Amino acid sequence: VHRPRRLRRTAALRNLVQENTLTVNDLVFPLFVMPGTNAVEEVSSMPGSFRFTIDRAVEECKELYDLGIQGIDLFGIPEQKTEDGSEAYNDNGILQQAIRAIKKAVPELCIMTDVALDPFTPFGHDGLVKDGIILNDETVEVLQKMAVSHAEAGADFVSPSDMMDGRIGAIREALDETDHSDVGILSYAAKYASSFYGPFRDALHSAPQFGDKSTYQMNPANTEEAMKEVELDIVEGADIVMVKPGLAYLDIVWRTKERFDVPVAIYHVSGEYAMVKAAAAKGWIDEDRVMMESLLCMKRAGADIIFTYYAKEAAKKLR
Amino acid sequence: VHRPRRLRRTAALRNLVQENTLTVNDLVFPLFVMPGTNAVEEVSSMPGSFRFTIDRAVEECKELYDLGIQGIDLFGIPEQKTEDGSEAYNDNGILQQAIRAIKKAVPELCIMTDVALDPFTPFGHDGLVKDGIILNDETVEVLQKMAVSHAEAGADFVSPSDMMDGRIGAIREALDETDHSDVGILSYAAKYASSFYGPFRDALHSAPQFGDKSTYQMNPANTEEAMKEVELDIVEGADIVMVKPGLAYLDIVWRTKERFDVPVAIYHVSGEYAMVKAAAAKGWIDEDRVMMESLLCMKRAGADIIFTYYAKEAAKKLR
Amino acid sequence: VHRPRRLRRTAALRNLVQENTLTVNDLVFPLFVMPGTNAVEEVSSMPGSFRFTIDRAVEECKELYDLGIQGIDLFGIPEQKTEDGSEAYNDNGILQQAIRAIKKAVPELCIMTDVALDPFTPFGHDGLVKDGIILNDETVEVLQKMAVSHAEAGADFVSPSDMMDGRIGAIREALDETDHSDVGILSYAAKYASSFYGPFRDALHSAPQFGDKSTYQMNPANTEEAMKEVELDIVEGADIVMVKPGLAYLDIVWRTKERFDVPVAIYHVSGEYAMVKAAAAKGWIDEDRVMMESLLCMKRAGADIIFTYYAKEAAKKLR
Amino acid sequence: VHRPRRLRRTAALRNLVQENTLTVNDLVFPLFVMPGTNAVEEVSSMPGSFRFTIDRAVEECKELYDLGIQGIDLFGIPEQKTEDGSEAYNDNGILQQAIRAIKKAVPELCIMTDVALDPFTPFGHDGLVKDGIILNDETVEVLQKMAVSHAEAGADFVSPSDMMDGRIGAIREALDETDHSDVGILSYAAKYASSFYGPFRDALHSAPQFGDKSTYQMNPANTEEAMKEVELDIVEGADIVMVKPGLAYLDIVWRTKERFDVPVAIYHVSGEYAMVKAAAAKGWIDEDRVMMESLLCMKRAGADIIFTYYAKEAAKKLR
Amino acid sequence: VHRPRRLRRTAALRNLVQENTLTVNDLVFPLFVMPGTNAVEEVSSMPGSFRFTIDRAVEECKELYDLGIQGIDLFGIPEQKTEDGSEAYNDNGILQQAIRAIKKAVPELCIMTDVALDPFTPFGHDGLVKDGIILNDETVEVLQKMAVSHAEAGADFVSPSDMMDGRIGAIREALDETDHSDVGILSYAAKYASSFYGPFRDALHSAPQFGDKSTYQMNPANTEEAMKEVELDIVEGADIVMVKPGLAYLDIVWRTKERFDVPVAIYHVSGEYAMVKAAAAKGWIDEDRVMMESLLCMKRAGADIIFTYYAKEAAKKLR
Amino acid sequence: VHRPRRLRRTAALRNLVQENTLTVNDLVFPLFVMPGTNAVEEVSSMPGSFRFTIDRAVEECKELYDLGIQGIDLFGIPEQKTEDGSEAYNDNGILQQAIRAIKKAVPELCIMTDVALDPFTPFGHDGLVKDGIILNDETVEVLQKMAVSHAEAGADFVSPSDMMDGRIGAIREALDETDHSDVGILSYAAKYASSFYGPFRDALHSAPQFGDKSTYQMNPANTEEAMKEVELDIVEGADIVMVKPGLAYLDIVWRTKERFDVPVAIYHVSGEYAMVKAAAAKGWIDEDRVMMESLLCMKRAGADIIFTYYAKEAAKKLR
Ligand SMILES: *C(CCC(=O)O)CC[C@H](*)CCC(=O)O
Ligand SMILES: *C(CCC(=O)O)CC[C@H](*)CCC(=O)O
Ligand SMILES: *C(CCC(=O)O)CC[C@H](*)CCC(=O)O
Ligand SMILES: *[C@H](CCC(=O)O)CC[C@@H](*)CCC(=O)O
Ligand SMILES: *[C@H](CCC(=O)O)CC[C@@H](*)CCC(=O)O
Ligand SMILES: *[C@H](CCC(=O)O)CC[C@@H](*)CCC(=O)O
Ligand SMILES: [Mg+2]
Ligand SMILES: [Mg+2]
Ligand SMILES: [Mg+2]
Ligand SMILES: [Mg+2]
Ligand SMILES: [Mg+2]
Ligand SMILES: [Mg+2]
């Protein structure tokens, strides 16, 4: 009686019933900005990924937008790393310059900016360290000024990847106070303590991360705790809530979409990206096929936004 | 605290968070075929719609598929109308000739065929009439042969618009018996007794429709009864289920999608089409914008397939 | 075994099981009030619709109530349009006079009043414009005084169609402060950026609307975002929540009714009205049948109140 | 913040927000028919209710339909009572004569017929008795013939009040076999062992009811068991399901409507009717107001059809 | 296969599976206290009901508790009725004396006290009347002092039957402020504007109730609005929430129990009581059977507490 | 108020609250068997994976079970490939020899056997090919015999990976007929048309896979269709249901577990395995940590059984 294969008999039927499709409007391109002029350094552990000087990020953002990419996520690599991480909220900071430069050149592009102290401190942590303890409230107060700093330079969205308690609310208070109630917050609501973050940590040159990040980042075994975490951020006022990492976390994505009535974002992490890249170099997989299939998997799971290092290559195929 | 306008501040942000999108793959173009060679009669009450000869129907389907449309829905206008409606299951019938011709020329296109006795009988009803009563089981037995007839001509899908009880299960049985278990059924599961079908009625020249069709077509006031209708049709083995009419019935479309786990189809009826067309001719509305917005509304309501007479125009804009 | 057609066999059975019915108590008549004495101007793009002088609105409200209509929605057309839109909260305003006059003549009628700056400003926007940006908070403070102004003149309900963030709460604070805790608020909770608003914009003579209204009005593709929008307004204290537009938005209506335990209102928009009117002028549809069927569709979708320009014609048929 | 009294401040507002309404189309009038010509005996325990002769029953039905009542429920009082209850399926039985006479005179009225052995047997039970045991399957086999008998006389619906297991499926089978698959079944799905049926019992003169009917009629303490009872009856093929008694059973009515997607019917029992009637005669209550409020309560509980002895009085007021 | 009658075959099986049972712990006895010494007046419209002088209420409360009744609801009939209703919060009031006397004699009994201005004012309303408008906030401030007055005299629970907005919260604030955070509140959360309250209004001799109570008491047609009403009272801090009236409102009771995780109370109103009493006087029903069946109906619907005038007669049978 | 980091402050607290854990009992080791004696060929595209001879397969299973692995999944590589794939049901086939040998040596281990025609046919598809069409019912009839063949050799479970319609029910029928109603079925219920199966394909040497397998394997874009697929398979009688591929499909795994009440299995595909393996060889990721985290992710998604090529390595670490 029931033969499901009827909806798969032809390409002309599979497209009709196809529940989900990937578009360029689902893609956000992360951009690493280092100091200097006219230099582009390839990440050794992320083939195809690059460190960009401000002038080169500007031109990259032209190519990105012309391909139809709507948003970018900016990551800063400072020349000086300090224990108090005060360079994070420097108005003359490399990140701040990048925002200001890109907003001038490509105004129609949405500039999302990372709000974390990870590459701004010698300990390699998202927050301030005292006696081996990564502090909560002391960090958030630094995070407040950082988000203000980004909004000041002209940023559209701030994306705090710190995983501190109640930072989203404080940042909302901080941004509202400084005439930026129109600058949005993409919370990294359920960021897990993953072993998939390798290639990202050498890409930002962040100094030895010391002890692991299990004091604040989620236990990879937990599902219910992600639901608690996301809700707190929505009550705090987050416009968009993200789950990280991506591929092996598509179950959390589904739970967040089915339950919260808020745009869902996902991170196609460096490790996932390096996995596809290394296996294709050996000839064991097809890079193009796996990268696109995995991006469609994220759309099926219920993600609306995908922060991916394959965004530009994905943009070219969806033209 | 909460400012939803943040996700509306720029075209860049609106596109990232946009929950639903319209594609060429959500469109099916209904096609009316009349007897003769090389003639295209425009429908008076549907500007832009045409009665096609088998040879010019082929011409249209080349143009349709090249624009990226995956499926068509065929309607036949027979030279002769009989009380027993036997021409419906004629193997040399115009409908059958059109299927066989289109399938030869453009094989990669999905041919869906209307299974109803409306234009084949002088009484203008979907079934066989006796003493003013439109008969159920006697009709289905004729419909069984009709559906088999289409499959024999080369049809991919059959779309029974009759609204007789238990027709789908019997058609499934009849199709399975004649080695066509790979031919699908798109059921008009919740088809309503609407006054929006005016322009469709004179388009197929169907003879005096007599009294209304409230004895079998659903009461426009009923919601819970659409759920009952759809289920029976799924248990019977429908691959796709349809809600008709479209615009003013998007609540039913949403109920069907949230409850049944089966591809949902919808009909953008001739009345809706003529309504946009007549108001645009006066300059009171923008044709392109209203037609596209109404199509987006249907995707939002949770439809996957849209039977629309604007399909080709919409395809041109999404190209 | 199961033959649903049994409940459709006769008119005497269809009425018994009929899930929903339209009554006069479901209808609200929108009224446009222009300055002057003894003048009634027909809207060129809305046949059957009229611009009313105060003395003529009074007499119209007699005919409306005598037919059994319980509520009216007042729209003002001022002689002077100012960039600050201060005429909106003028106690001697044409809208205010209308409220005061109608309340004297027909006390038993519920006067709902529009709270938006659309026809009161040269830019044709629901709010105040600065550097091309339609302001949020600055607008709401003007909206506060406007609602107070209406309540002062004797209005029963205020219906803010502005689509600003947090206006409903502020208006509730504003009305509570000025001894009007008994004057209700019908929020336009999920008003979409539609291309169906044409004939309404020329009816209020509102000056060229400049750029589109996508910064605040909802994306026609969004369903989940409407659920977020409605809830915020209910927490803010809205007595009634409306979805706009109507016919092609019946899915949102269903979601709002099934989830919020609050009276649901809907807007039968000018474009929908002009569509039925233009097609009937051509003879392609039956005006009476389509207008009533579409009103029943709204009752089926779960609406309690219908703001419709066919209200009086609908009232006459339901007598 | 929240003031619900805002929607109660005026008759104009109460009517707009009113969730449910009572219509003539929700009313079915039960009619008792006795042997003889031209005689109307008033029931002592039901003031306003009458025993009717076939000829005066016709007279009543003209008056009923002209007031707008769509359906009647017929009860027969036979001249002779036999232990095998064979008069129930007599083709010249008074019930059958009444069906055939009413259907000729007022054809546009829906005739529903009681299928029970209560007034046809000396033991006063719904089924056949053996050794003090009211038999199940032996009863249903008699009920099958009874239902067929009514269909043969011209009945539109059969309403089996017996509360035997699996009776509906068998009646459906029996009706389908005898070319009556178009005749519906209104099942007394959750009929309770109530003490409210006093005035109904002497009205049909049913001989000494013996011991109570707790062996088959539901325990007034059971909720979950009504859900079990109703489902079996729907799977068996009931078109409408009924809850009995009415007023004190509105919770069951709500459970049935929220869970089953099938038209729900209810019985306004003789005891409820006599209760209002006796208290009004003392001047302790207002008859008109209580009868109407109780009918509104049933519509609110989610019933669509109401079997009530006040049907004609209610029809007069809704006219 | 499935024969439900198996669980009804014997009394020894019906008791095992019986889902719900009525106990004495489900019963609360309402008590009307008039001024004077050694006098008991029978309510003409409520046979079996009595007006009690303080000394006679004390002795009645002995008989009530000895039968196993845990709670009583006290209603006051003052010698003087004033427009400001200041006698309501008089420490020397007849109600206050009753509380104090009964608490001395039967300490183990739970004294619940009515908090409404109905029999304390000449207009016969639950609140203070100004220009025909029954005031909200002005009433609640009087209600605050009334509840304090009751708690002062030694009351256990206060049961506000006023149906004013936000009274439960204010009374909670008022009781908390005056060292009575341990005195509970049984809110009349969803009290409907019923025509069943007749015999209660003459029992308290309350002066002509003037215009009806539709400005604050619920529309008998509304279900969703009861859900909104109950929640507000639970957020305000109500320990117990009641639905009124009882029998014809068992659907609201079910909705309240299934959704709110809070003890549910119900009122077996005077009109329901007078209905059973009048019909039994005629011999049409069995008083004992109907009274107990209807009390079990309330337990089935999900009520925990039943305010009933048959409580003592019910207590005697459940001994 | 809320600080989730409290449950992350120490390893002592993280372990107490940890929602999910990985055990040796959640692991199944897939085993490839080739013809010959005493030979172990390592897969070029899967480092760590091996082609085993029946005798060395036994050797492996001793080592596997001693580490605590409860189940294995056997794949056969036949010396000869025929178009009818008859070697699949050969009783002296290598697969059958391996079952019979392993079951003798290590009896306490659960032998699960792959039921597919992929490595047995030159066309490289799961079913029989005719005119470019992979046949359904003709395939299942061969699969029936195959499953019976395994049961005859001594298999405990059969795991059909074919993705033909209605194969499970027929296999259940076929197994029950041949006195093997105690042999289970682990259905590949939602197997997707993935590009992750590269390294598995050359491992079993399966001849040119021809065109893709989108005619029967699920579209990676479909969520609702996995729910439809799984249900049919459960109604057919599957004891365990599987989702494939794994990591990028954890949303489907969660949907299946939350809805179906049947043990959920998952496949850690060769592509995922090669991805971790290739990236670790470059030193971009930690092999041990990523492999274990991905396995934990699967347990979190709600899987109970995990088919993984890292099973033995994982078993060593959990020892
Ligand atoms: C139903 C209508 C048949 C009829 O009444 O003629 C099947 C075809 C639907 C077409 C919709 C339209 O374009 O009106
Ligand atoms: C059930 C009652 C039969 C009986 O016990 O006599 C079927 C008829 C219901 C009538 C309800 C009433 O009016 O009491
Ligand atoms: C499905 C894949 C068959 C094929 O396409 O060769 C059944 C076996 C799954 C193995 C998964 C893997 O390791 O790739
Ligand atoms: C979160 C993780 C920081 C770290 O531990 O390196 C902030 C940035 C996420 C992207 C990581 C990736 O691409 O893997
Ligand atoms: C909302 C839309 C304003 C506009 O854009 O014109 C306020 C009034 C709604 C009615 C519009 C209609 O009737 O189409
Ligand atoms: C609510 C109703 C007051 C009234 O209108 O009389 C407070 C007391 C309820 C009991 C009424 C009854 O027993 O009917
Ligand atoms: Mg957090
Ligand atoms: Mg059907
Ligand atoms: Mg809003
Ligand atoms: Mg039954
Ligand atoms: Mg209240
Ligand atoms: Mg399957």
Side-chain angles (χ1 to χ4, degrees), chain A residues 2-10 14-15 17-21 44-47 133-137 163-166 192-196 198-199 201 212 214-226 228-229 232 245 247-252 254-255 271-272 274-280 282 284-286 289-291 293-294 296-298 300-302, chain F residues 2-10 14-15 17-21 44-47 133-137 163-166 192-196 198-199 212 214-226 228-229 232 245-252 254-255 271-272 274-280 282 284-286 289-291 293-294 296-298 300-302:
Chain A
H2 301 263
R3 289 165 184 271
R5 280 185 65 182
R6 290 191 205 106
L7 302 171
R8 300 162 208 160
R9 198 167 54 82
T10 178
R14 291 191 297 269
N15 294 336
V17 297
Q18 194 166 123
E19 298 170 31
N20 301 300
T21 61
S44 66
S45 60
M46 285 158 84
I133 308 301
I134 295 96
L135 300 173
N136 194 61
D137 293 25
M163 275 295 291
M164 300 295 107
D165 299 330
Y192 286 84
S194 194
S195 59
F196 293 51
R201 285 164 181 178
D212 78 322
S214 52
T215 46
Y216 52 98
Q217 280 183 331
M218 284 197 58
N219 192 325
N222 294 163
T223 341
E224 292 292 305
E225 199 206 6
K228 174 173 80 178
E229 277 282 344
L232 288 162
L247 287 184
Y249 289 84
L250 256 60
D251 68 322
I252 309 298
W254 179 257
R255 293 197 75 176
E272 289 164 14
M275 267 161 63
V276 182
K277 224 80 175 177
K282 293 265 88 183
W284 309 340
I285 58 157
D286 185 317
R289 260 138 39 86
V290 168
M291 291 280 197
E293 187 188 321
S294 51
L296 224 188
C297 284
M298 292 163 161
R300 185 196 66 249
Chain F
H2 300 273
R3 289 170 188 269
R5 284 189 61 182
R6 288 190 202 110
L7 306 171
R8 309 188 194 115
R9 195 166 53 84
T10 173
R14 291 192 290 269
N15 288 1
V17 300
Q18 185 173 125
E19 295 168 33
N20 295 299
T21 59
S44 73
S45 55
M46 289 156 78
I133 303 297
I134 295 90
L135 302 177
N136 195 70
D137 292 24
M163 279 287 290
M164 301 292 103
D165 297 330
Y192 284 88
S194 189
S195 65
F196 289 50
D212 73 331
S214 53
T215 52
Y216 54 99
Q217 279 181 324
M218 273 193 62
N219 196 336
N222 295 161
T223 339
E224 291 292 303
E225 200 201 37
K228 187 174 81 179
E229 277 290 336
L232 289 168
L247 289 189
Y249 290 85
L250 258 13
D251 61 306
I252 307 296
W254 178 256
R255 290 199 79 182
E272 284 157 15
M275 267 164 60
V276 179
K277 214 83 190 189
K282 297 260 87 177
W284 305 339
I285 60 160
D286 182 314
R289 260 142 34 81
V290 169
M291 291 277 199
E293 188 187 318
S294 43
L296 223 196
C297 286
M298 294 164 165
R300 186 195 68 249

Side-chain angles (χ1 to χ4, degrees), chain D residues 247-252 300, chain E residues 243 245-255 266 294 296-302:
Chain D
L247 289 189
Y249 290 85
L250 258 13
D251 61 306
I252 307 296
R300 186 195 68 249
Chain E
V243 177
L247 287 184
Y249 289 84
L250 256 60
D251 68 322
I252 309 298
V253 184
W254 179 257
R255 293 197 75 176
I266 198 180
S294 51
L296 224 188
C297 284
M298 292 163 161
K299 284 298 302 290
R300 185 196 66 249

Side-chain angles (χ1 to χ4, degrees), chain D residues 4-5 8, chain E residues 162-168 187-191 216 218 228-230 232-233 236:
Chain D
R5 284 189 61 182
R8 309 188 194 115
Chain E
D162 57 280
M163 275 295 291
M164 300 295 107
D165 299 330
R167 90 277 206 193
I168 303 307
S187 180
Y188 281 64
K191 197 187 213 270
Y216 52 98
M218 284 197 58
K228 174 173 80 178
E229 277 282 344
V230 169
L232 288 162
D233 286 351
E236 277 169 42

Side-chain angles (χ1 to χ4, degrees), chain E residues 156-178:
Chain E
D156 300 285
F157 252 79
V158 296
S159 41
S161 64
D162 57 280
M163 275 295 291
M164 300 295 107
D165 299 330
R167 90 277 206 193
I168 303 307
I171 290 161
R172 184 35 67 202
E173 191 184 47
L175 286 173
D176 291 335
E177 282 177 344
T178 44

